[PDB]
With several copies, the nearest count.
Chain A
Amino acid sequence: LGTADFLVHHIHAFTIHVTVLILLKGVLFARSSRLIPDKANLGFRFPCDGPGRGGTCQVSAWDHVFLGLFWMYNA
C-alpha cells in the first residue's frame, strides 16, 4: 500500500459520501422543505410541482433515488 493506493482510497470515500448525500436528502425532505411546504401530500413519486417559484422539476423523493442510481453506478 503505497501512495497510488492512498489516492484511490480517498476516491472511494468521496463517491460513497456523495451517494449518501443524495439518498439522505431524499429521506429527510420527503415530507416538506422550505420550497414546497406540503410535499408529503403529493405522494412518493410525482414529477414536479409546475414551473413556478423558479421551477420545481424533480423534488419528489423518487427522483432523489433516481439520481442516486448514477452515483451508485459511479462509486
Chain B
Amino acid sequence: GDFLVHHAIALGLHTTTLILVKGALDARGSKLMPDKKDFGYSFPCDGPGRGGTCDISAWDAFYLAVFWMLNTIGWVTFYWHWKHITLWQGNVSQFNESSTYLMGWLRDYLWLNSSQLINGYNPFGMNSLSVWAWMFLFGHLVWATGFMFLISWRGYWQELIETLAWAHERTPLANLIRWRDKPVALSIVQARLVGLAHFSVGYIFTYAAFLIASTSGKFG
C-alpha cells in the first residue's frame, strides 16, 4: 500500500511543479503572445483573437497551481492520518489490505471514520462534537460557493447588474437613495482570486474538522 501511495505523492510534485515551472519560464513571452512581458505579472487575458487567450498570464499559472497543491497535500495528510489511526488502535492489518484499492480508502477511511463526527447534533441530542459537526458542513458550504466564481464568468453577471441598477432607479421611496460608487461585477482576475479563496478556505475547514473530530472522538 505504501508503495502505491508514494507515487501518487510523487505524481503531485511533478505536476504541481510543471504548472509553476511552465509559468515561470514562459512569463517573458511565448509563441501565442511573444510580448507577454509588456503587460505585467497579472492581466486578465488577451482577447478572443488568435483562437482565444483565456488564462494566459503567469498569474494564472500560479492560479491553477494551488489546486494541485491542495490535492497533493490532500494525498499526503490523508496517508499520514489513516496509517496512524490504524496503528493507534493496534489494527495495522486494516490499512495494509484496504489501502490497495480505492474503495478501501473511500469505505474504510472516509465513510467509516466519520460516524462519530456527523452525529454532533441530531433530533435526539447534541454532544461535544457538535461544533466540529457544524464546521464540517460549513466547510462544505464555502467550498461549494467557490465553484460559483470559477465556472460562471463575468459577462453574465454584468448584464444582470444593469437590470438591477435600473429597477432601483425607478422604485418609489427607493430612488431617494443613490449609490456613491456605481455598482459593477467583479473583474475577471478578481473572480478567480475570490473563487480560489472560497475553495481553499472550504477545503481546509472541511478536512480540519474531520481530522480533529474523528481522532478526538476515539482519542485513539
If A34-B162, A54-B187, A55-B188 touch, does A49 touch B156 (CB 8 Å cutoff)?
no
Chain A residues closer than 8 Å to B158, beta-carbon distance? 35, 54-56
On whether the beta carbons of B159 and A59 are closer than 8 Å, the reply is yes
On whether the beta carbons of A54 and B160 are closer than 8 Å, the reply is no
A interface vs B, CB < 8 Å? 25, 29, 33-35, 47-51, 54-59, 63-64, 67, 70
Ordered by A's residue number, 25 sampled pairs between the chains whose C-beta atoms are within 8 Å are A25-B160, A29-B159, A33-B162, A34-B159, A35-B159, A47-B48, A49-B48, A49-B155, A50-B47, A51-B47, A54-B158, A55-B153, A55-B185, A56-B154, A56-B155, A56-B158, A57-B154, A57-B156, A57-B188, A58-B152, A58-B156, A59-B155, A59-B156, A63-B156, A67-B152
On whether the beta carbons of A57 and B185 are closer than 8 Å, the reply is no
Chain A residues closer than 8 Å to B46, beta-carbon distance? 51
The secondary structure that dominates the A interface is loop
Chain A residues closer than 8 Å to B48, beta-carbon distance? 47-50
On whether the beta carbons of A55 and B159 are closer than 8 Å, the reply is no
Chain A residues closer than 8 Å to B154, beta-carbon distance? 54-58
Chain B residues closer than 8 Å to A25, beta-carbon distance? 159-160
Seed contacts A35-B159, A51-B46; 20 additional CB < 8 Å A-B pairs: A25-B159, A33-B162, A35-B158, A49-B48, A50-B47, A50-B48, A51-B47, A54-B185, A55-B154, A55-B158, A55-B187, A56-B154, A56-B155, A57-B54, A57-B154, A58-B152, A59-B155, A64-B156, A67-B152, A67-B156
B152 CB, nearest partner CB in chain A, Å: 6
Chain B residues closer than 8 Å to A59, beta-carbon distance? 155-156, 159
The answer, yes or no, to whether B112 is at the interface (CB within 8 Å) is no
Interface residues of B in 134-172 (CB under 8 A from A): 151-156, 158-160, 162
